[PDB]
Amino acid sequence: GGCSPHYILNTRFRKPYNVESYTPQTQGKYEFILKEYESYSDFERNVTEK
Amino acid sequence: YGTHYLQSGSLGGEYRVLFYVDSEKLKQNDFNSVEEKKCKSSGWHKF
Ligand SMILES: *[C@@H]1O[C@H](CO)[C@@H](O[C@@H]2O[C@H](CO)[C@@H](O)[C@H](O)[C@H]2NC(C)=O)[C@H](O)[C@H]1NC(C)=O
Numbered sequence: 460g461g462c463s464p465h466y467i468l469n470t471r472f473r474k475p476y477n478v479e480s481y482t483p484q485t486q487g488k489y490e491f492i493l494k495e496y497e498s499y500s501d502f503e504r505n506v507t508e509k
Numbered sequence: 510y511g512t513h514y515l516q517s518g519s520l521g522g523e524y525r526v527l528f529y530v531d532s533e534k535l536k537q538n539d540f541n542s543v544e545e546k547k548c549k550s551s552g553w554h555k556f
Pocket residue numbers: 503504505
């Protein structure tokens with residue numbers, strides 16, 4: 460049996476006997492992490508004997 | 510079923526944004542220079 464009116468947007472659904480609820484609890488979580496690292500090190504010498 | 514039921518309320522949507530930026534820059538230059546001389550001369554008159 461069943462045949463209670465269940466809608467999502469304009470689309471109407473027939474729920475299974477087994478299912479208590481199927482309901483559009485919409486949600487969204489985005490997550491962005493960017494980590495850039497640089498190191499440089501320079502070493503020189505110049506040395507002369509005459 | 511939890512602990513309570515909703516006696517009244519509003520429905521709609523929540524939008525949140527957290528956005529964070531952290532830039533550091535370091536540049537360092539060290540320069541050192543050393544110059545040394547000796548000179549010597551000896552002679553008499555011949556040497
Ligand atoms: C070692 O000597 C070289 C040559 O003089 C140096 O490089 C020169 O540096 C001068 C001044 O910055 C520039 O005008 C030249 O074009 C460079 N030439 C070359 C081939 O690099 C260098 O910097 C010196 N290094 C140290 C640690 O004294």
